């Protein structure tokens, strides 16, 4: 084998769809960890979140997936907590100079339409939109959108409002006319 790194956070591997060198597993204590293969090749994890996902990974062989990478944009992942809210963590990277060291920039909380959600997954839409398909504990599967939350509301000297979103790229303007 190419490398063998002894770690206890060895569970469900989800490769990053935008960068194949990054994968993220968790552990028995619920500790999530985002890795880089090059650091293990050469060996610390790139990130470590204490008790982010459900515990008891060794005991139960039927575990729901409450952590998903983002297939709509890079450096993002969604974590589902207590079946009610989805935390969209957005990461930031800097190169110490090609391995990008990672740190958490912003976390966005989205309340689910219906409670008691066990597992979930993304739905990529047009214009960088995001929607989430979720399966409840009763087995009902529904579809939930992500609202366009304004990230910046600035005012001009001509009394003009400029609105920037957290999801898409377009910038909205309300002129005084």
């Amino acid at each position: 084998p190419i490398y063998q790194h002894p770690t206890r956070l060895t569970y469900d591997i989800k490769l990053n769809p935008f960068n194949d060198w990054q994968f993220s597993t968790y552990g028995d204590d619920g500790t999530l960890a985002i890795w880089d293969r090059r650091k293990l090749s050469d060996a610390s994890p790139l990130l470590t979140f204490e008790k982010l996902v459900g515990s008891g990974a060794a005991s139960r062989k039927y575990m729901n997936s409450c952590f998903r990478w983002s297939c709509v944009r890079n450096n993002e992942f969604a974590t589902l907590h207590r079946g009610d809210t989805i935390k969209r963590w957005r990461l930031g990277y800097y190169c110490d100079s090609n391995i990008e060291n990672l740190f958490v920039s912003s976390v966005h909380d989205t309340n689910t339409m219906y409670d008691r959600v066990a597992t979930f997954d993304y739905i990529p839409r047009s214009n960088n939109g995001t929607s989430l398909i979720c399966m409840r504990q009763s087995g009902t599967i529904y579809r939930m959108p992500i609202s366009e939350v304004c990230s910046k509301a600035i005012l001009n000297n001509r009394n003009s409002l400029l609105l920037s979103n957290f999801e898409n790229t377009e910038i909205d303007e309300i002129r005084v006319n």
């Binding site: 944009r73 890079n74 957005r90 990230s151 910046k152 600035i154 001009n156 000297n157 400029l162 920037s164 979103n165 957290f166 999801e167 790229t169 910038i171």
Partner: peptide
Amino acid sequence: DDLVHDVVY
């Protein structure tokens, strides 16, 4: 091609 962070006049 990604998220617009800051807008300033």
